[PDB]
Amino acid sequence: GDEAEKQAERALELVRKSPDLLKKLLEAMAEELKRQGKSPDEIQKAKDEVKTKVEQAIREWKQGNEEQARKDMRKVLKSPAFKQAVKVMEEQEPNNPEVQELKKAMEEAERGSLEHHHHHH
């Protein structure tokens, strides 16, 4: 399933160009994780995972390493944490171009590949 690689490239460049979307993105997932009754340690580690995953991806693309960047973003596209991040902001800003264009990248990748192996660490 190699179309989902380019879906990661599209969501990667969105969070690379909009750090103001990204700073709310990790911060929004923490609230839906909190509605489920998760611990402050697991919430904090989930914010840091999402942040460090995209940072290590963007650091590769910027040195010309597109393939390593879209790979490290792909693991986030399929993650439940990134689905919570976009879902919490879609409730607040339903007409947002920055939410709907990011959500569409994931929603199309969800049909471009079907990955089942591990979940929730």
Closest listed residue to residue 105, CA positions, set 2, 10, 18, 40: 10
Residue (of 90, 87, 82, 21) closest to 53 by Cα position: 82
Task: Look at residues 70, 77, 75 and name the one whose alpha carbon lies nearest to residue 103.
Answer: 77
Experimental technique for the deposited model? NMR
- In residues, how long is the chain? 121
Report how far apart, in Å, the C-alpha atoms of 107 and of each of 62, 84, 90, 104, 121 are: 26, 13, 13, 5, 22
Q: Other CB atoms closer than 10 Å to residue 86's CB: what's the count?
A: 19
Among residues 85, 107, 80, the alpha carbon closest in space to that of 7 is found at 107
Enumerate residues 6+ apart whose C-beta is below 8 A from 33: 42, 43, 46, 81, 84
Q: Assess contact for 70 and 6: CB atoms under 8 A.
A: yes
Phi-psi region of 37 (alpha: psi -120 to 50; beta: other; left: phi over 0): left
Nearest in space to 15 (alpha carbons), one of 58, 46, 44: 58
If you write DSSP's letter for every residue of 61-86 in order, what string do you get?
Answer: HTTT-HHHHHHHHHHHHS-HHHHHHH
